[PDB]
Write a protein that binds this ligand. Structure first.
Ligand SMILES: NC(=O)c1ccc[n+]([C@@H]2O[C@H](COP(=O)([O-])OP(=O)(O)OC[C@H]3O[C@@H](n4cnc5c(N)ncnc54)[C@H](OP(=O)(O)O)[C@@H]3O)[C@@H](O)[C@H]2O)c1
Ligand SMILES: NC(=O)c1ccc[n+]([C@@H]2O[C@H](COP(=O)([O-])OP(=O)(O)OC[C@H]3O[C@@H](n4cnc5c(N)ncnc54)[C@H](OP(=O)(O)O)[C@@H]3O)[C@@H](O)[C@H]2O)c1
Ligand SMILES: NC(=O)c1ccc[n+]([C@@H]2O[C@H](COP(=O)([O-])OP(=O)(O)OC[C@H]3O[C@@H](n4cnc5c(N)ncnc54)[C@H](OP(=O)(O)O)[C@@H]3O)[C@@H](O)[C@H]2O)c1
Ligand SMILES: NC(=O)c1ccc[n+]([C@@H]2O[C@H](COP(=O)([O-])OP(=O)(O)OC[C@H]3O[C@@H](n4cnc5c(N)ncnc54)[C@H](OP(=O)(O)O)[C@@H]3O)[C@@H](O)[C@H]2O)c1
Ligand SMILES: CCOC(=O)CC(=O)CCl
Ligand SMILES: CCOC(=O)CC(=O)CCl
Ligand SMILES: CCOC(=O)CC(=O)CCl
Ligand SMILES: CCOC(=O)CC(=O)CCl
Lengths: 280, 280, 280, 280
């Protein structure tokens, strides 16, 4: 009207400046997720399972996801070792309607969702793209890595808007900032940069209620990278300052930092747990 | 075998170092495109038409592209004002098979293609993405902006490999590096950031024969941006160091520099003709 | 010799792959700094004091630094509220010899240093640089913001190498990635980008023993930004997705995450706690 | 007053939008530098001499610079092979007063300066920085590479402001975006990132009259890189997608593009002629 300031990025923020949130006084009590539901996508893999366990260790009602590797002993293992409500859902991230059904079924069994981690995807292991004459492997990467992240984010955002709070954590890769040297995977790099910039784009629109960030890792030692020839894996160590492959336990710290109240001002950022690979 | 060096990025480069190309002595003679065919995608718009004319002015057999705005007087205008062979093709960039037909029909009427400019796309003008409940506008952006660029690049590369020379120029946007402040277009930013990294990824694989670059512009004064409300267009000038909107004649210099022999060492780069918008 | 791999970045890493560190199983126990000394530079200001308190809250022997605002009641307040050994040192960060004396006097009163935070600097508040005709304000910024960070890093590194472990945290600013729009501070932006890239450069060299990272913040509400006119401060909110100014308690989470064992794989990264300012 | 728009970046732009410049119709006539003076710093080396010759070939009154390698046959060679007024000046770029004397002596013998290229610097060839115990090699790099660029760009700006037109081209390196893998040069990388971000920072302040850009090259084949051991030079080819070292004739195209009217909208950008080194 008159005398108030209106934002240039998102006009729905209201009369600026927006009131700052109330934060604890002890630093260690900021990272606690007590009384929060954390739906982690692809929580039946290498990085997803570690993040789900780390969120459960912080007292969170984690929701497990799987597609073809049934994970119901994983959900039960978190409901008896830490006493946090958990469940396992079978969803095809590439199916627009299945994602909606699987997320509306999580806001009902848990009451609400306060933390989301879009951490599902597949890798391109077909060599240079100029050798494949069928647009079926490219279409698959863009369907699970990029389109799936949008399907998950478009539905979870609706839950955050009504609640007015939330935190989305897209799991891109260093392929969204560099090009993998030994292997030639252009479709994979293209999809991960798309997710990395989509996380930033949603931050401006979700600023009023939620937050969006990225946890782009490096060459973590999961079931994804444990197929490459030792000759290929030898060129990864030679180009990593730390000179090794990160473990799944070296990522939980970054994932729990962007989901808790500790990162109450980090919006649309990119935490690069790469071991220094993107620096050279 | 022994004594020779093999590249870490692309093993097909051969025994390193690769021999440097032969370049003219006069700088002004490096920018000439005499005896070269330059197929410019979407050459019936604002930026495509200017680039096609600029390539024709440099003595190049430019090929015009259009989808729904017939451009045959444009192709004829370039065949009588500069004396360079030209033609117009109707292709749906979002159709995987139509692109193949339209590119194989250009390698036959011109003999070869030496310069390609994937410069076709559509903008997202639906406001914040959390308000559209149908994945039909998102699917369209990812089909014309991202998938179209891959269809154009996957076919043109097959022509460069046989010839051993070429230059691809993907026309991404500053949306691949920033988020447009006043308007909220997440699907558009995601698609352009995808192309900006696909160009880099293809540079590693096309290193042996061709080169790939990006001409990410700012807020150029074309038919794309001549619909936004003056209130929206007023926030673009306020956040641009140069404090105005660039013209289509201020982009041809960057397009002719990455297509000619002047940029014989610029591979996988990103020339940002934005007026300084990404700096603030 | 033969059969072992030697790194391309730093040849002192040894025969790759380097053995991964031993990490706790509970995520919340990774962030604990028990039995660690954390020397925080400029710990008598706005961000330095908060980081020192947060490190003390995590059970660390924090060392306070000051130049002209005596901080000895701050050091005592941390030695009686948390029971962690602490002390205050008066050092001129711009004096090469004083830094050496003040760091050597900290490795003696504490036994060792396990965490360092180069978080001292001054701001450029003289308007556009083309109006000052004396190279005395530019020389001051490059002496405290950039040269001081090198003096601190060149001496602290000599302690990490002997111990074989450590973590350096340079506090750059978003000015190392963008240009502050309303105010015109070129010397300040130049110095902060220098620190931001120096942190990355030292990561490759300190890879064998220590780690180096950056905590580039946004427009935090400290004594540095509480002088700008409300007209200037009104343009900061309008260009921040979160639409406000961050608090000093919203930065401790990032500082404690890059100093503890949680970030045991984050080397040469850049955690941007800006509220989304660098996104648009 | 009322109805006009005032910029957020630089309030001296005037009532927005700023009128666009008048540009030729033929693309090849945009790159011509006829009737322009182009003072190229460090024009007695590898890249400086090539840029000076390329500017002279485009019809420009180039001014040669040297410190310890007298270059007066180079200036005379450009005044008899192309018929363009030229002269040679001996200046110590690290001396604040000498730069002022050498630039005021160039605005007098040529009438004005329309193009400046701050392209003087030295490289760090002392190995890892943790082995040198004297802050004299670090102080030299920050004096010639960073401070020298500010001295050159602080006096030239005063000439552009009175004329209202100009173009500054700082010659940073890929070291301002990456860390050189085989060699360990932290002081050099720190100084080049400083120059790269200073070019962007000056773009916002010089928007009203002049333009500032960067020509960050890769591993060009000049006298600077023709000392490294073939073992070191072998790791440069292996990590360069193009798999070779660029020549000084592959940079002139980029330097003439950012100095002429072709890049009349490229302000505060960064043209990376690296051969694809920064992509991996
Ligand atoms: N080093 C690395 O592996 C690395 C690098 C950086 C980033 N990332 C990214 O991190 C994510 C996690 O990788 P990871 O280590 O967990 O690999 P992983 O062991 O292969 O697990 C991938 C996860 O994604 C799920 N998933 C795959 N395709 C799916 C589909 N079509 N529909 C639904 N769920 C699907 C898998 O479920 P099921 O197994 O149950 O089918 C599993 O939970 C991936 O997006 C990967 O790109 C990892
Ligand atoms: N300021 C800006 O506009 C701006 C900013 C940065 C980047 N860009 C990018 O520059 C490119 C060109 O935009 P412009 O300025 O030329 O806008 P334009 O005047 O709307 O022209 C767009 C061009 O793309 C073609 N095209 C659109 N959809 C197509 C489809 N489905 N199949 C085939 N061709 C299709 C159009 O052909 P028809 O008209 O014949 O259908 C036309 O040639 C776009 O990719 C845009 O993203 C421009
Ligand atoms: N919003 C922000 O303020 C912001 C933005 C991003 C980054 N930063 C950076 O964060 C750092 C901390 O700033 P701040 O928030 O703590 O404000 P501040 O209180 O002004 O910080 C300056 C701190 O450094 C010390 N210091 C200053 N000049 C010194 C010198 N010449 N020698 C030794 N110590 C010196 C001061 O100690 P004394 O007061 O005791 O002299 C004080 O502890 C600065 O480097 C700033 O550039 C802050
Ligand atoms: N591959 C590369 O070499 C490479 C990589 C990227 C960027 N660069 C940068 O490009 C610039 C040019 O290097 P170059 O290829 O021309 O090699 P160079 O011949 O060694 O370049 C140095 C140039 O600057 C002058 N110069 C050096 N120190 C000076 C000082 N203290 N005062 C005044 N003038 C001084 C030299 O003049 P005198 O010889 O007459 O003293 C010479 O013209 C450097 O800044 C370099 O960092 C080059
Ligand atoms: C061997 C193929 O493995 C990969 O795709 C590696 C990554 O995901 C790195 Cl982001
Ligand atoms: C008003 C919508 O117009 C746009 O989308 C503008 C651009 O393309 C900038 Cl890249
Ligand atoms: C008003 C001057 O205040 C500043 O310098 C602000 C910052 O440090 C932002 Cl990094
Ligand atoms: C062997 C030392 O040579 C260098 O410093 C190389 C460069 O300047 C690359 Cl930017």
């Amino acid at each position: 009207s008159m005398g108030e300031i209106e934002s240039y990025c998102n006009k729905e923020l209201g009369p600026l400046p927006t009131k700052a949130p109330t934060l604890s006084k002890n630093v260690l009590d900021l990272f606690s997720l007590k009384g929060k539901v954390a739906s982690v996508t692809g929580s039946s893999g290498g990085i997803g399972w570690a993040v789900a366990e780390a969120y459960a260790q912080a007292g969170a009602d984690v929701a497990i996801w799987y597609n073809s590797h049934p994970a119901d002993e994983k959900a039960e293992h978190l409901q008896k070792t830490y006493g946090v409500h958990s469940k396992a859902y079978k969803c095809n991230i590439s199916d627009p309607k299945s994602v909606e059904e699987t997320i509306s079924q999580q806001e009902k069994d848990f009451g609400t969702i306060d933390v989301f981690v879009a951490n599902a995807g597949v890798t391109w292991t077909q060599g240079p793209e100029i050798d494949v004459d069928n647009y079926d492997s490219w279409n698959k990467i863009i369907s699970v890595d990029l389109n799936g992240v949008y399907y998950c984010s478009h539905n979870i955002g609706k839950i955050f808007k009504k609640n007015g709070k939330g935190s989305l954590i897209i799991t891109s890769s260093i392929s969204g900032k560099i090009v993998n040297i030994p292997q030639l995977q252009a479709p994979y790099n293209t999809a991960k940069a798309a997710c990395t910039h989509l996380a930033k784009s949603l931050a401006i629109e979700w600023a009023p209620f939620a937050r969006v960030n990225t946890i782009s890792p490096g060459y973590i030692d999961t079931d994804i990278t444990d197929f490459a020839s030792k000759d290929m894996k030898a060129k990864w160590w030679q180009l990593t300052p730390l000179g090794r492959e990160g473990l799944t336990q070296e990522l939980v710290g970054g994932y729990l930092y962007l989901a808790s109240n500790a990162s109450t001002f980090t919006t649309g950022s990119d935490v690069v747990i790469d071991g220094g690979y993107t620096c050279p």
